[PDB]
Symmetry: D2
């Protein structure tokens, strides 16, 4: 089958196109014929070698994917060939205390597709039936593929970690990244008043159309005051920061006392600094968050089918232009998700 793979751990030039045997489905497993694969930051991390070292090469990247059920292994129930589905990137054992508690993302054997094993940058992929979910009919394959990873991550942050509720002033940093665009929508869904920050008026323009109530350009090293102004001088109650590596000094200045700040986990190895004194004294909470319970995908897709949440496909390129896709992310030039059309 056709697939993009990485011969080495370098820049986007390491991603090449080759042929690999079509994987076969095992018991309780399912083979999917991919129609679309979404790019994720996790991809670039592994591609550089900052994540998942000593990984078997060549490697097939890709955590987000959508398509049609090609074949089911022995003992499979709930899926058949021809069925449209989207992948749920969370691979867990399903036996440990964490999994049985609905916390598979905390499983000691937790693995994201394309991180440890071959992902969605191919025409085919096999995975446990439990990791497959029906694709909504009102969406295109590309749109479907862009949902899972970022929506899951933004859901844990906004709902479970920040406990967002109506009345809350939510600050979403760097509107434009996959996590951001979903966090803005989910936060609105929970009655929040969203304030989104970005580095260009163009991204702010898009954040506004996405549902943001107020927007702030952090190009000006005084944006925290603006955020304070927009929130009656008290600052944001809850903050969604998909990185923490962007003017975090300001973020905390924009955050209300007792405020909560959620930071989307990443294997970027980024070493920075976190203000102790004037952070814990103001009783601020800084919560690391990564992916989310696989159970979150069902209600997320439902809201997407109802139209309350929408995927944000900024660009689509052919699977073979995977390299070009990575440069689009590394150069941060697209508002929303980057999707690869497969087949």
């Amino acid at each position: 089958m056709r697939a993009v793979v990485m011969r080495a751990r370098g820049g986007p030039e390491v991603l090449e196109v080759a042929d690999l045997p079509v994987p076969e489905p095992g018991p309780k497993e399912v083979r999917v014929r991919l129609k679309a694969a979404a790019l994720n930051h996790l991809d670039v991390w592994v591609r550089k070698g900052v994540a998942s070292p000593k990984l078997p090469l060549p490697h097939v990247l890709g955590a987000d994917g959508s398509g049609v059920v090609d074949a089911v292994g022995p003992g499979v129930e709930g899926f058949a060939p021809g069925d449209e589905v989207v992948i749920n990137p969370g691979l867990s054992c399903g036996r440990c205390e964490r999994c049985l508690a609905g916390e598979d993302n905390l499983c000691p054997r937790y693995q994201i597709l394309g991180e440890h094993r071959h992902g969605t940058y191919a025409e085919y992929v096999v995975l446990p039936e439990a990791n497959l979910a029906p694709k909504p009919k009102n969406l295109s394959f590309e749109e479907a593929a862009a949902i899972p990873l970022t929506f899951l991550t933004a859901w844990q942050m906004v709902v479970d970690k920040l406990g967002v509720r109506p009345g809350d002033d939510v600050l979403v940093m760097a509107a434009g990244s996959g996590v951001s665009v979903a966090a803005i929508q989910i936060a609105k869904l929970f009655g929040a008043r969203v304030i989104a920050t970005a580095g260009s008026e163009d991204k702010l323009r898009r954040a506004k159309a996405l549902g943001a109530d107020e927007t702030v350009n952090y190009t000006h090293p005084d944006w925290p005051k603006e955020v304070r102004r927009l929130t009656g001088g008290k600052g944001a109650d809850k903050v969604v920061d998909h990185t923490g590596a962007l003017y975090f000094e300001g973020v905390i200045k924009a955050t209300a006392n007792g405020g909560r700040i959620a930071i989307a986990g990443a294997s970027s190895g980024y070493e920075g600094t976190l203000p102790f004194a004037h952070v814990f004294y103001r009783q601020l909470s800084i919560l690391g968050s990564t992916m989310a319970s696989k159970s979150r995908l069902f209600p997320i897709l439902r809201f997407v089918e109802e139209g309350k949440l929408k995927p944000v496909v900024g660009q689509v390129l052919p699977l073979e232009a995977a390299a070009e896709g990575h440069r689009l992310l590394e150069e941060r030039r697209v508002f929303g998700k980057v999707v690869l059309q497969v087949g």
Copy 2:
């Protein structure tokens, strides 16, 4: 193999010994050679026909069980023949929203072993690897088999439903019967002051031995008054009831303002009238609870190995005497679990 089948629905006499073929473990399944099967009131409802209608016959009852791993399916890890284990009676599909969230006991396809599928009243039983936990080595097989079902039910009521915490006055109804044995111990484990009620002086004496700080006899028409007197006149904060529909009026009377009452399988007789406006005006909360999440069996067994929680085996009977065992249980005379010894 030897097994106690259910020829037809009716009195305990319908339970007879028969020879059934040995079940074979599927892909992710394992066959356990049973040593002890604990008796639950659920087995009685199935026997009488009150539960699980349209149930094929013959049927093997039994939700609780302990034993040794006999054989394991092809693709199965974490279990080998010889391993001592106890059964996690909760069966679900592990693919729906409820299951992925850990709330398997709320799965639309949720099933308790022995309720619809052959249970533990045999020398062998086959279940998914997800429903098997290591048997604590400090316990006898009859003690181990007695844990699961009641400890899980008592745990959801005390920990999740009632949110028992140190300083709480917890009231447990009818000691020695149902989930009281486990509820008194879990309650204390969470820092509460337990007040237990029973009918005989023996059971109350038995209650204190389990950790009950105070005892009350509900054979008197004014026992609710003693509970009030025993808690500074305010009444109990949290209440664990598995009988109800008889003393419920007394419980409601014994419950302090804003108190919480957790009800297990209170399928008693008449429902009188239930003095409402008493539960509303005083902001009381009545919570129904059946079983618990499979994940809860891990902390339980851990506390059991430490000796902070322990099962109470009231009587042991040979497997071929399941009938006599159902009699003992139906008359609620024995203090503790009735356990069948298989092999």
Copy 3:
């Protein structure tokens, strides 16, 4: 000053106009010149004698009220004469554990204005500065007076008790009566899909205008079946009931598995028998709720100024017609609040 005193306990005719001396504000107290006093079912229980026995006479009823600051005690800040305000009907000692925890409505000395102390059925009333909130400027005095009592009760039931969240199917009983008006709006505010039930077509039509997504008529012996049909057959997840003791059997039937039912002042007639084992087997939860924490009045009024929540004034009557007002309320005919105009 003019006031409607309660000469004796009995029918609404016991309410008569009398001249009482003007109360004087203590140290941290303030005297409010009332403009409107909203009528609550509580005023009726006090009038009949069913509530607050040993109550000195004459007594001035009235828990809800709005007006202008008249005079303030010596040591008081944050209030000046001329300021428009609404009353927070919750009176507590503010020194006990319950009060310091915010749960003032659970204070052992908790008292609702007008229940034991002179209320709002007069031209002036004196209460602690802690029980006064700024009146939203976008509302008329009768609209303002209608908010507090019902919005606080509906909020604790929806937000704290039921934990309503987006995607939830909330069922509100008897629209236009009690806390339904507020519950339908708060429910929607928290992202639920509201199904409202009423007796007349007018009230149901009125319900949808308030945000009710679906409507059902409980005049039919099978209305519970419509709620089930209206929620994918599963039933309502959360239920707000302020009547009970009459349709409660229907509610329980309309409640989905593991559902929660919040009950306000369901002090209806007979209690029939209440089909238990249905609330236990299906793990249902019945929660009693009276009033709410004073702190909750702040977010409520904020949403009211934004227009996300709005009071519904059913009828206005001059203060001297409190008697006629109690009739209108006792017959549960008027849709919305019955508000007395003082000055």
Copy 4:
């Protein structure tokens, strides 16, 4: 009256002994004749000038205090002369949304005694009746005084922020500090298995006697591994760090994935660094915590009266040796609290 005051903002030499007019009680206020005053870190901070700048000098330090009610102002209820009491250092307005919600420590007007106004380093002090609590009879004045501030702070951290429960492995850093000794006890009370760290075997010896299950000396730059070893290799689930400025790099290495770490707020202005990448990726939560709801003191004292919690008075000196007391803290030479006998 005799009292210790600070003429300037320098070392412990600025604390002098002088005479100041005896403060008079106002409405709803109470004058206390101090018998003992406990030293707190907050004291040294303000004494140096790192906290509460532009504060009126001379200033009377002291947040913790116990003694006898000297006189009550007009309109006081609940207290009379001769009554033994301990101070609740949290001064809040009692009107803002935070206060009425039981979150007075989050009030915008929150002030700790001795931080903004004259504290307990005198023979007399006046404060709102709401800030006074009855001293348990089984305790000496010195012992009583050492409870409030640190126990309150350790309570919010352990119970509210870390949500400690039985089964949890709690890591308490720097056993010896006021917060630590209380955190160890409260954590045990909630069923935790406590691991305490310190720099000398002597403090570890005392932490063991206090209730710590396991102890680790962080003098050895490899202690995190030891903590991991003691917790089956998974690390601590919850961590109490009353500073964060002590081997925080190790703390996070000793913390289990998904773990929670509570840091006691301080106006030390300590600027350090917080590991981003490998912290949020492991889904760690870092929670700033300061003081606690005044409501927490009641249940805390109760547990002290029951004997479940005990104050830890490491040393007592005469009020006039306040300077010496501060050097004992600045030189960190005492396990537990330092108390000043007054009068």
